[PDB]
Amino acid sequence: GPVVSIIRDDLTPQERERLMMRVRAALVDLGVAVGASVAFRQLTEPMKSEIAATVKKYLEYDH
Amino acid sequence: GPVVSIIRDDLTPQERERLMMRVRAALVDLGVAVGASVAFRQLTEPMKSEIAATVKKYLEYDH
Amino acid sequence: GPVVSIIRDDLTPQERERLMMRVRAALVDLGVAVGASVAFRQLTEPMKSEIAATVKKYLEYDH
Amino acid sequence: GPVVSIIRDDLTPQERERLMMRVRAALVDLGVAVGASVAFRQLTEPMKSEIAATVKKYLEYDH
């Protein structure tokens, strides 16, 4: 029953690639914004640490 | 000499806020993309570590 | 013959798959949006219940 | 002052509204797709239950 599989099946290769491409695009955009900030010397070390900790919290990366 | 100051002076409060708002916007977008990925269980621990390391490299955050 | 069947016949496998793919695509998009919301801690328990009840109402799922 | 707050502060009203609008838009799209499916009598009771359970799982709604 193909129709049941359409509702039930885990993410397809194309769907998984789409989700990961959104992560990649956000990472590129963050590098662009941070690259400009760092060039204008706008991020102190505590500010860098807070950005890094925010991202680790998003990732549920417990380090 | 106001005209000279317009070329020479360091970033104004408004310019600094604009640069930092772009960082914030990219951080929100990354949280949105990562939030969706983590919900679909798409990020393994090594993939999380690589994303975190990429951001630290952008930040020139040597930890 | 054939021309009458083209108007009268029930949905073909291809047409049924197209309809169910649109349901799947909307479910993925809802998981993406909800995944981001839940990551930013934006949905309280009553809000979750209201979203679930909305979907059950769409489905005509009387539970 | 301000620049630190731009990195640190919790989501603003505008940002919260944008996140919730994406949930609303996905819910409308799911109602559109399900509305078409139900009209063509394409969802059995078990299929409805599976869609509802998928959404509750997204929501982390433990009912």
Cα–Cα distance for residue pair D45/D23, rounded to 1 Å: 25
Side-chain-side CA neighbours of residue C13 (13 Å) = 2
Cβ contact (<8 Å) for A20 and B37? yes
Tell me phi and psi for residue C38, to 5 degrees: -65, -35
Angle between helices C13-39 and B13-39 (to 10 degrees): 130
Number of domains in chain A: 1
Contacts of B58 in chain A (CB under 8 A): 30-31, 34-35, 38
Of D14, D18, C28, give the one whose Cα is nearest residue B36: C28
CB B26 within 8 A of CB A42: no
Q: What are the structure tokens assigned to D30, written together?
A: 């799911």
Residue at token pair 């909305």: C54
Maximum Cα–Cα distance across chain D? 59
Of A40, A37, B12, A22, give the one whose Cα is nearest residue A51: A37
Q: What share of chain B is helix, strand, coil (3-state, %, to 5)?
A: 80, 0, 20
Angle between helices C13-39 and D13-39 (to 10 degrees): 160
With CA atoms as reference, the chain A residue closest to C32 would be A19
Of A10, D58, A63, A32, give the one whose Cα is nearest residue B46: A63
- Which chains have at least 3 CB atom pairs separated by less than 8 Å from chain A? B, C, D
Residue at token pair 């979750």: C48
Q: Provide the residue range defining the domain that includes A27.
A: 2-59
Instruction: Establish if D8 touches chain A: CB-CB under 8 angstroms.
Output: yes
